[PDB]
């Protein structure tokens, strides 16, 4: 029948980054790998990720002012930040631990490397599993499926 090659069994938690800045994340279990993954994403994209998570708490307007207000109004009105809290509580316990680990990794990168975090996204920290759920929820249902432009009667150029 011919089996796939042997899986690798990670014996310690490490990220091996290659020349192009691609993180190879080895965890001894699922929450480790997810933590590693949140660490790596914060290394590579922390500023925007944190900004995006701040928006998905419906706190865009509060953190960054008027250019963020319409998304705030769109997401609060569609009850996105609170549904995220619910969705979070409704996760299976095993998967909830993975989301908590991912948020922890993001937080821990920002902790051990405060110089790498742009000043005006600092107020966002700490981030939580629910934050991670919320952003995914804005992305899928409230950017892809129901865009503010289709409802408010607009949309973006070519």
């Amino acid at each position: 029948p011919q089996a796939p090659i042997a899986a690798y069994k990670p014996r310690s938690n490490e990220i091996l980054w290659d020349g192009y800045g691609v993180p190879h994340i080895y965890g001894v279990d699922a929450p480790s790998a997810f933590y590693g993954y949140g660490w790596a994403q914060a290394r590579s994209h922390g500023d925007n990720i944190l900004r995006l998570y701040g928006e998905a708490r419906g706190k865009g307007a509060e953190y960054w002012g008027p250019d963020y207000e319409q998304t705030t109004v769109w997401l609060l009105t569609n009850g996105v930040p609170e549904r995220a809290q619910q969705w979070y509580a409704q996760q299976s316990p095993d998967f909830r631990a993975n989301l908590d680990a991912f948020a922890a990794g993001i937080n821990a990168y920002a902790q051990q490397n405060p110089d790498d975090i742009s000043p005006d996204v600092r107020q966002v920290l700490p981030v939580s599993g629910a934050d991670v759920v919320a952003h995914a929820h804005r992305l899928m249902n409230f950017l892809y499926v129901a865009s503010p432009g289709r409802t408010l009667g607009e949309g973006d150029p070519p």
Partner: protein, 522 residues
């Protein structure tokens, strides 16, 4: 976005092939892709995902892989309400809104926040919005009760078998996307996925418009299970594809027709020229190697030139203006590829913007309309040659104004520029027929343009044992101020010089440049 999956029988080596190829903005927060590799004792996944997602959406490993394209799954409804008496008319009765008073803080220029009131009103349908013109709109979004989107993707991409993958996909927690699957066992699959409301009447266009919000007749409550949606598994054609086209030619020969599904799932509109190229590139080629598969992904044919130039050119050589005559001659000598060194390409684009509108999608100019029966060879020809020549006249002007000449090399105007890296462009607009896509900006005052949208993450995988995979990320793997990992891939992109994606531990050890040990305890 493009997606190919090729069955073993269609390949030289007898292993399946997979193309990951999403097209998104190069310059937009939540659309930025990231490449990573996760390994535990129990699972392995490699690939790309939008930043801030804890699961890889374009994943593969030693056993299986998936990819995604946008399908426009109409998962929401906008309802036009009839305001009357402080409530809204519904089934002959005035019915009041649910109201709550919420608030949010707004940051002021001086660092303080003011407290801002926000009324939130809902009808039966959902939350209510007032458009700038006065139309009160209530939005009803399917699948607000599907909390397992993330875990579904995670279970799909770590599936131990096609059956496990399918069971995971069937939970209906991922509300959108065409999703394509291939594996080392030899199975390939296309699914038009998403959460689709059950409706008793109306086509897609009716459901995309403003549905009347004054009647329970239009209030849906239920959604379609997975086996109500268009799907294809190991088709007789030996491949599946999607290029953002309607789900009606996911393989060749087709395995179903539009009348087999409710009419509101997906449109029956003409297929883009890129989508037409997708179908031929796959169906016309047998005995594929990974190398040949990769070469096919680079296709940049100016298909619209093929459909129009045989009529346009003879018409234009008749015109008295010598500049029009010279444009026609330049156009006729063109091999109709979007190469860096093309002197006719920019000029052709500008005529096409007039002939088919600014997004190149208009159909009115063609002599023969797109037809379900010749679905990769229509629309064809020029309906009004005289009118089109006048369009060429204006296009000569526009080309000169934008770029400085009617014959500037494509890749001198078309540049990929990140930080201080500046490289020649090639390929172009999907709607002109280019498979590999670069949606070029409007040019700057020097006629230089750059991609706004197009090839981002590109990976091609053969499920041999061990797997073989090659990828590139246009805009690098990081976007933090000062990273060396933003502009460090684009030169390779300009040469189509793909990285071997490193999955096996020994390969990873040979390539490591930074070790971060970490330790996590809850």
């Amino acid at each position: 976005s493009n997606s190919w999956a090729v069955a073993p029988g269609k390949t030289a080596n007898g292993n399946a092939l997979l193309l990951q190829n999403p097209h998104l903005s190069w310059t937009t927060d939540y659309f930025t892709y990231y490449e990573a590799h996760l390994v535990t004792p129990d699972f392995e996944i490699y690939g790309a995902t939008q930043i801030g997602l804890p699961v890889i959406r374009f994943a593969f490993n030693q056993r299986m892989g998936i990819t995604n394209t946008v399908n426009g799954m109409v998962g929401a409804t906008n309802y036009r309400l009839t305001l009357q008496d402080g409530g809204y008319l519904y089934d002959g009765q005035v019915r009041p809104f649910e109201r709550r008073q919420a608030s949010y803080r707004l940051r002021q220029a001086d660092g303080t926040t003011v407290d801002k009131p926000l009324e939130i009103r809902s009808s039966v349908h959902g939350p209510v919005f007032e458009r700038a013109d006065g139309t009160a709109v209530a939005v009803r979004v399917a699948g607000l009760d599907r909390p397992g989107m993330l875990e579904q993707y995670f279970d799909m991409i770590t599936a131990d078998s096609f059956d496990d993958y399918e069971a995971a996909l069937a939970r209906m927690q991922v509300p959108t996307f065409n999703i394509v699957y291939a594996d080392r066992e030899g199975t390939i699959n296309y699914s038009f996925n998403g959460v689709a409301p059950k409706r008793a009447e109306g086509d897609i266009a009716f459901w995309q418009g403003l549905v009347p919000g004054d009647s329970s007749r239009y209030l849906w409550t239920e959604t379609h299970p997975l086996d109500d949606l268009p799907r294809v598994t190991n088709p007789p054609g030996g491949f599946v594809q999607n290029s953002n086209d309607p789900p009606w030619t996911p393989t060749w020969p087709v395995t179903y027709t539009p009348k087999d599904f409710p009419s509101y799932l997906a449109p029956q509109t003409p297929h883009s020229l890129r989508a037409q190229q997708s179908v031929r590139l796959m169906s016309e080629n047998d005995d594929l190697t990974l190398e040949r598969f990769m070469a096919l992904q680079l296709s940049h044919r100016a298909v619209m030139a093929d459909r129009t130039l045989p009529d346009l050119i003879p018409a234009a050589l008749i015109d008295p203006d010598p500049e029009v005559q010279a444009a026609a001659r330049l156009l006729a000598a063109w091999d109709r590829e979007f190469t860096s060194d093309s002197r006719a390409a920019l000029l052709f684009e500008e005529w096409a913007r007039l002939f088919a509108g600014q997004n190149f999608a208009g159909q009115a100019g063609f002599a023969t309309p797109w037809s379900l029966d010749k679905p990769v060879s229509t629309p064809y020809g020029v309906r009004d040659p005289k009118a089109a020549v006048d369009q060429l006249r204006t296009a000569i002007a526009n080309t000169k104004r934008k770029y400085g000449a009617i014959d500037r090399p494509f890749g001198d105007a078309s540049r990929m520029i990140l930080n201080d890296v500046n490289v020649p462009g090639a390929a172009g607009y999907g709607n002109l027929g280019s498979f590999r896509v670069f949606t070029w900006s409007d040019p700057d005052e020097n006629g230089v343009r750059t991609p706004v949208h197009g090839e981002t993450w590109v990976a091609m995988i053969e499920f041999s044992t061990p797997v073989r995979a090659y990828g590139l990320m246009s805009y690098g793997n990081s976007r933090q101020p000062g990273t060396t990992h933003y502009s460090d891939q684009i030169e390779r992109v300009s040469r189509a010089d793909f990285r071997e994606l490193l999955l096996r531990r020994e390969q990873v050890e040979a390539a490591v440049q930074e070790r971060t040990p970490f330790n996590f305890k809850p």
